[PDB]
Amino acid sequence: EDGKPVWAPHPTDGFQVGNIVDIGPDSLTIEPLNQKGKTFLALINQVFPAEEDSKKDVEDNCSLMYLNEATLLHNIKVRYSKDRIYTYVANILIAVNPYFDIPKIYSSETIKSYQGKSLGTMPPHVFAIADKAFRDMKVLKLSQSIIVSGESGAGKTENTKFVLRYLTESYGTGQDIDDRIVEANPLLEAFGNAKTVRNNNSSRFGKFVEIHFNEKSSVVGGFVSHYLLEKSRICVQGKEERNYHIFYRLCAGASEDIRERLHLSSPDNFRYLNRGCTRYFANKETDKQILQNRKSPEYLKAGSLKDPLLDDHGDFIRMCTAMKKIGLDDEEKLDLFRVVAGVLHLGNIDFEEAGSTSGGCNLKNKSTQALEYCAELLGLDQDDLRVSLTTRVMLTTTVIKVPLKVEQANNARDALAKTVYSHLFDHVVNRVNQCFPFETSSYFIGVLDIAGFEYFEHNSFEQFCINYCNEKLQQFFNERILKEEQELYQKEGLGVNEVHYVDNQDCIDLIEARLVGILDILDEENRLPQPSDQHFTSAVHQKHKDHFRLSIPRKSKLAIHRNIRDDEGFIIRHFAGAVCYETTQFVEKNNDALHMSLESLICESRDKFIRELFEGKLSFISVGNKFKTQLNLLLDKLRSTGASFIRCIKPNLKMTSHHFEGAQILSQLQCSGMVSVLDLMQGGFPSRASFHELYNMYKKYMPDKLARLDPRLFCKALFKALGLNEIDYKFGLTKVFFRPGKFAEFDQIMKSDPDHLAELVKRVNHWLICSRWKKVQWCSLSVIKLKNKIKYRAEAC
Template identity: 65%
Template sequence: QRSTSLLYANSTNRDKSYRDMRTTRQSQSIVISGESGAGKTESAKYVLQYLTESYGSHNGLIEDRINKSNPLLEAFGNAKTTRNNNSSRFGKFIEVHFNEKYRVVGGYISHYLLEKSRICVQSQDERNYHIFYRLCAGAPESIRSALRLGPPDNFHYLKRGCTQYFCNTQTENKLSKNRLSQDFISKGPLHDPQLDDTNDFIECDQSMDHMGLSTQDKINIYGTVAALLHLGNINFEDDPESTKGGCKVTSSTEQSLTITSEMLGLDIRDLRNALITRVIMTRTTSKNNDNIIPVPLKVHEAQNARDALAKAIYIRLFDQIVNFINKSIPFSSSNSYIGILDIAGFEYFPINSFEQFCINYCNEKLQQFFNERILKEEQVLYEREGLGLKKIQFIDNQDCIDLIESKTIGCFDLLDEESKLPTPRAEHFTNEVHKRNKGHPRLEVPRKSKLRSSREIRDDEGFLIQHFAGGVVYSTAQFIEKNNDALHASLLILIQECKNSFIKSLFPKLPELEQSAGKLNFISVGSKFRSQLTDLLNKLRSTGISFIRCIKPNLKMVPNLFEGGQILSQLQCSGMVSVLALMQQGFPSRTQFAELYSMYKSYLPAELARLEPRLFCKALFKALNLRDADFKFGITKVFFRPGKFAEFDQLMKSDPQNLATLISKVKQWLIWTRWKTAQWCALSVIKLKNKILYRRKCYIDIQRHVRMHLVYRRYGPRIRGLVKAKALHEQVAAMEKIAAQMKANKEKVYQKIHKLKQHIDQLINQITNTHMTAREIEDTYNDLVSSIDREFRRLKQAIAEQEMKDEQERLKKIQSGLEHEKHKKSDEDKRFEQENEEFRQRSAIAQRQREEEQLKSKLTAEESRRQKERQAKDAAEEAFLAEMNEREFRDYDLARRLALETGSEAELPHLQRRRRPNFNQKYDLSQHTYAQLRDLINTSCDIELLDACREEFHRRLKVYHAWKLKNRKGRNPSVANDRNDDMDQERAPKDVLNNAASLPLMDGTSKKGGQAAVASANSKTGGSGKANEQRYFRIPFIRPNEQNRDDSSEHKKKGWWCAHFDDKWIARQMEIHPNKKPVLLVAGIDDMTMCELSLDETGLTSKKGAEILENDFEQEWIKHGGREYLKKNKGQISSKYVIQLLQKYH
């Protein structure tokens, strides 16, 4: 009731559309917009009712049919959603046509985008279209039995949603139990003051009667609706007998298949085959023959085919119903029309699919149209007329529309492109939308949604678009299927050949569609909707326009509840805030000066009619006492505040007496204006005279000030220069006070100060007696100031340096004393530490030598004892062998004699006792090659094997060098060069080699028993030190070839032979000779030219003063290029310690 009263109270807007239609002779449109459930459909009803009752024939048939068409359209096009119990699931544009007398003569209804998917599936709290429930609840028993209807629970297309009826108390009691669903029985009916399924069926049936539909037409419509319900009950299962993976109709739904075929006028076998197979037609060489190939469908494919057939039939049925209505309200001649657009409002559900995408796209286009007509065009007019009003800011949604409809990268084009692929996939389409529109401000991924349920959608399953009313996440899972409403060929051919004439009329054969059929030529639902929407907007742009904004007061859909926050949000999103701001400062009514002049010229006398139109309008408004804020003059038009033009028009069209009063007021205003103009002219002349006298006086003052300025400009710089020059004496006086404190160069400083005084006096004299320019005075003054500042700084610096020098001398004396004591103490500490360190190292070396000597003496005694034991053992063994040989000899002699006595022969072997072999050697490496020994040393982890390999390696080196020495001695002495080369290749000093010669030979004997014993013992115990101990030695060295030279030869100079032992084998060797390049050798690189003796064999440990510290060796090694030598040959080094040392170098 409140919305009704508001619409009728707002009848001025309806009259405005009607009056504009009559005045401009242009058709008008009324756009009704708002959210779902805001009352758009109800508002459209009241607008239609107002127009037909106000401007139609009383009790006219056409007007009655226009109003009575709403129940029929709502029954087949409206449904219950979670946001609105009577939500329009389609858009409609109702045209009310008028004749030349501007009376209603007919109408026409255009509809857009009926929601097809709702026919087959709904969410839990939503219903299918109202007609299904009204047929089940309100149809007479005869119709129900004929159509074999039951409660909504019995039908697959209804039972997955809400199955409750809308009822009031009376109709609830009249419903029989065989019509009720389980939810209705357990939960009760749904309540809405506007809806009642039982009564609404009766109203729908009566609406058909008003539209002129016959009884057979109604039976055909009800039968088609019932056939869709039975069609939905057909179910499928896998066919085990099919070799191609086909399916079949389940036995439990065979009855539904029979009922459906009967109602649709189809053969049951043909319907069965069309549902479980599809036909592929291939061209042959013959033009008239095509090969038909049946392809079995899987279970889900058959279900999709069934649903596609149901959607196609219902869509065609809805089109036919709209055609019935249009035929019932025809118009033979139309002069103009008023169109009412009622289209689905902006929608956002927990799951939004293709229907919501199209509806919201439509609302974006309508919002842009609203902005253009109300905001953009209005402000452009204000700017063109020069009203100077503040520009209103509003949100432009063109970028959002471009995202949806742009060529090649828009969502619609990408969807059509995906649908044409051999295997279209929703994930690929979604990824393409994100990829092609990356960085678009209106496009986001679903996880950025504010709704938790929407954030669970993956990036390839949907996208988020920021609409003018808010962000909506669209699930793209069914976009491709819903964008293609084409029925596959076998079902289409079947339905076109059915025996039911009504169904057959819904699917006429169109040759142009048959020729263009194919995947690449199909016309998508999105393309059709864009085309329809473009036609609609073109139609709206060609008409005058009015807008009705419906506001939803609350989300609970209950009366007397006003939610301010939600309402404010709707007003902001719909652009109403910007419109209200424009209306507050705008001028909605406007007319041209000439039109206003011609409109009221006939009411005025001749003297007023001769006025210029702009002046006439100004005089007219002043006579009517209109405030300046109520109107505004533009360049070609005059603009009025809301309602002011109507007041003005009413005054001008009032009775003649009042008009005469207005005319007299106009004359008075003109006289008053002209008198005011004359007064203003006289006052202007007086003001001009006074201004001339005032300016004459001002000229004298200006001349006086100019002369004063010229004098000041001429002598001012000299006066300022004198003042500044005299001020310099104060600075010089300060310098004299500071100079008195100086001790040195005082006379020189006083001379400089005296010169500065002379320069100051000279500058003052020049300024006073000569014509110096301001630039010359300034330059001379700046030079003088710079000289004073420079001397002043030098003076201060000299004083500071003098003070600093005195302080430094004092501190220097103190510091020198402290430094002397510190250096003295430091030198003593360093000398003491150095002496202690040297003493410690030398003590350690001496201690080591004593320990080695003690060990050697101990080992010598031990070896002597063992030698005696071996000699005693050998003597005992020799005695034993002699005894055994003697015994054998006796046995042999006895046997021989017995043989002689007996005359027989005896051949007895001669036995000889031998020593038992020595099995103490663990590893036999005598058969290994040099390369095998090297591999074992580099790869083995067995310590004993490594030692044995090194022993064998150095044993072979000894043998090699012994062989080489032997062969050299046997050579021809005349070969001097070879001998000298061999002598140059001496591997170690002579005393080292001699010491090795006294050690055991290869067969175990020795030349000098004591030293041999010590060496043997040391080798068995692993040397004289710790395992892997590093030791360094340095002894004098003169090569044999230099010893034979004359004493006077400068070559016969003592050199040094240095060695680094890693454990008991030499790792690095260095020979340093005067005036010769040092010789650097490293184990693994120079094995053949290095000393092959072990540490014990060299006897270096027993030489006093031979062992040196590591630092001493490393200094000499690095000094003579040892580091570079190691880096150059780092891959061949065999000593692990040297390898680690090389890493430290890095």
């Protein structure tokens, strides 16, 4: 409406206040409220209606008159300076990290205050989700799941620890399992956590820490499960990225009585480390403790990497302290270093072309002493390993050896490193689960923590599997939100109603459908006698010529993406928008070739620790299918349990206390799927206010007679007086529900003509006396029917 404030797109704050002083077909001439004369232009989809009272905050976001992402951004801007870091959006908890310890919130008196209290009546906190998940376990007769997203530094580690604290305090009577995850956190900071372009410490796996509950409601055990891993990162990294952190912390923290036994050298030597960044994280004090022979030329030129918490020299010490606490001796700790060092001496093995004698490939002469120092770490013979890295062993039933091509041997040598390190991380997790064996199993409350929608300027194959994992989790997110709203309307007595659902199945079919999907073409290209990346890119727009979820790079508005040639990349639209991916090295990173001749050699090792790691047809196997198959084992497990979605917000780039950046927070609202769920709720009734809320707001505008009434009869009389439309306004059981922009329309009816409103209250005065009679008459008949129940029941005792 005219004259009414709208939100305006301001680059430094996301949205600010502003008014509309001219308009065109597609654009609005926006004049800011605080900066008059600045008068810019904005499009129809870039403006949002603002509320009249903007100085107030709400605990529950369904109490807003205008529910959008600009009024959600202003609600968490006001709450940030009131130190209210938790915010209730239906079944979604929005938690904002303050980087400081707030008083009394983690208190045990606070924990027993929340215990058993109804929902929504207590202030938002993370203990109000954990108490709800215990009650929607035992009552429901179904297991539960807490889903934690967000980027690194957003508080997703700290929110996980408060969940496990509440279960071993409020309901668990004893069981000290809570901090055994926390105490062996540096093991997963080495093995699983790596370095990405926008994050220094990022988890690259689906952490599923589950807590077993028995039928008697006691904590009987826990279990840690892991899903996904970046197979490519193990052997080849991007620009300025690192590999996993155990390949830097072992290099930085190793002593010289360990270096003589593992034959370690500086990272420049090793091909699985020199591709990316070789620098260590350190501080001034630990920079003095790093030995000269551990330093690479890049380390000499550019020095240590700066982080306030990461220290690759000092956290190797706090890793080996944690291996003493968890359950590992020094001999078993050394065997977890012999496997890591064997991977480093595998990547330097090169393959030339054979001298016409039987076809195939042979090893290079510069790779001879490098094989001798690697085969004793793997427990195998150097003459048998040379055959196994060059031949395809089969039978004619004699057993023949048929040599492989040069490119197939480079892919098979890196496939051994993507198999040994894959089973090594599964051995670390299984060893940790044997340090706290569960007593029994029945019901479970687990925490799924994984990285959010993460993307860079030029996206890789590693980020393609992350954004594909978040799209499938976005499908299940909106599926659980629609089910909660349909059983809210029934619970308030409004019954069933039609709501429009948004589908993303067409984006899923684009990526993973049989024969036509992007991962299906990628796995087929490996089978060709000559694989290409130009043939892969052209095949995507061969089979998918139409569709809106996919375009050419030149169609993008961004200049950087317009420099990409047609056969060098593609743009795939996801829930968080249009994300471009380049296709160079995509097939190479997907191609894995672990075959019989090498799979049945590392299992046959003379070393015993190596055989413990590994517990015709198919040759090259299906590599692009393992990414779909492993994810389906988690999605159907999430469908079988309840869900508790906790979205974690990072408020500023520096990660320092009391700083709000609305050009970085708004980007995480649109990359969390929060804005998508607010679009869904416009289809229903997004604005709802309890009877006590509408009594505190509107009693001053009413006559003194109507003001004397109780909140439910005050609202019932007010709804009947005005004569409101039944499809727009709905009278619930504890709340009044509204269609979009009709709580706002309601607020203007109360601010309109006092004499007209007084006359409508006069006209409903007979009905109001009759309603107030029947209220006390049927309440006295209620006490008499409960007196007749006490007698009827005690007649059968």
